[PDB]
Design an enzyme around this catalytic site. Structure first.
Site, PDB file in Angstrom:
ATOM      1  N   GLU A  35       0.778  -1.180  -0.005  1.00 25.68           N
ATOM      2  CA  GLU A  35       0.157   0.046  -0.090  1.00 25.68           C
ATOM      3  C   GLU A  35       0.835   1.277   0.241  1.00 25.68           C
ATOM      4  OE1 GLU A  35      -3.209   0.437  -0.531  1.00 25.68           O
ATOM      5  OE2 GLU A  35      -4.036  -1.754  -0.353  1.00 25.68           O
ATOM      6  N   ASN A  46      -7.490   9.379  -5.643  1.00 28.29           N
ATOM      7  CA  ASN A  46      -8.346   8.452  -6.688  1.00 28.29           C
ATOM      8  C   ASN A  46      -9.158   9.298  -7.601  1.00 28.29           C
ATOM      9  OD1 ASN A  46      -8.735   7.101  -3.360  1.00 28.29           O
ATOM     10  ND2 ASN A  46      -7.453   6.079  -5.152  1.00 28.29           N
ATOM     11  N   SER A  50     -11.688  11.332  -3.838  1.00 32.93           N
ATOM     12  CA  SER A  50     -11.106  10.867  -2.577  1.00 32.93           C
ATOM     13  C   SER A  50      -9.517  10.669  -2.858  1.00 32.93           C
ATOM     14  CB  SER A  50     -11.832   9.534  -2.269  1.00 32.93           C
ATOM     15  OG  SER A  50     -11.438   8.382  -2.850  1.00 32.93           O
ATOM     16  N   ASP A  52      -6.144   8.510  -0.626  1.00 33.74           N
ATOM     17  CA  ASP A  52      -5.964   7.447   0.316  1.00 33.74           C
ATOM     18  C   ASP A  52      -4.585   8.092   1.343  1.00 33.74           C
ATOM     19  OD1 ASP A  52      -7.860   5.751  -0.451  1.00 33.74           O
ATOM     20  OD2 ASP A  52      -6.165   4.851  -1.787  1.00 33.74           O
ATOM     21  N   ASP A 101     -15.458  -4.296   9.377  1.00 33.56           N
ATOM     22  CA  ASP A 101     -16.835  -3.586   8.654  1.00 33.56           C
ATOM     23  C   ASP A 101     -17.682  -4.560   7.812  1.00 33.56           C
ATOM     24  OD1 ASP A 101     -18.278  -1.173   8.205  1.00 33.56           O
ATOM     25  OD2 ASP A 101     -17.563  -1.368   6.049  1.00 33.56           O
TER      26      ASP A 101
END
Length: 129
Positions: A35, A46, A50, A52, A101
């Site tokens: 990552e 992105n 958004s 990251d 989640d």
């Protein structure tokens, strides 16, 4: 901060990630490598607008507030900048919410594509833990 592999493994262990929701420590180290390359300051924008953030590339549409992602939810109740700190506490605490989640570690695309189903123990081999 750019962590060493074993240094990050030890920090993640101290913060309770080893076997968190059944995911062994190597899974988390592997995810962080692909990552962010173990860099707490990593950011990536992105197509949806958004961004990251941090060592685990946590997304601003759902998890943190960056002030520029319209209609985002801030479920970790933190500014996204907190995820760039040399102290990984905020990233780990938010990652624990994400992995709980419902889709587990599949939330991290690099984990799904590069870690899942591999010998992830290799990522902690040699380390004093």
């Amino acid at each position: 901060k750019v962590f060493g592999r074993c240094e990050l493994a030890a920090a993640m262990k101290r913060h309770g990630l080893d076997n968190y929701r059944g995911y062994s420590l190597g899974n988390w180290v592997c995810a962080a490598k692909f990552e962010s390359n173990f860099n707490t300051q990593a950011t990536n924008r992105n197509t949806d607008g958004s961004t990251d953030y941090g060592i685990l590339q946590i997304n601003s549409r759902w998890w943190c507030n960056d002030g520029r992602t319209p209609g985002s939810r801030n479920l970790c109740n933190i500014p996204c900048s907190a995820l760039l700190s040399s102290d990984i506490t905020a990233s780990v605490n938010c990652a624990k919410k994400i992995v709980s989640d419902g889709n587990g570690m599949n939330a991290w695309v690099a984990w799904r594509n590069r870690c899942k189903g591999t010998d992830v123990q290799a990522w902690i081999r040699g380390c004093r833990l």
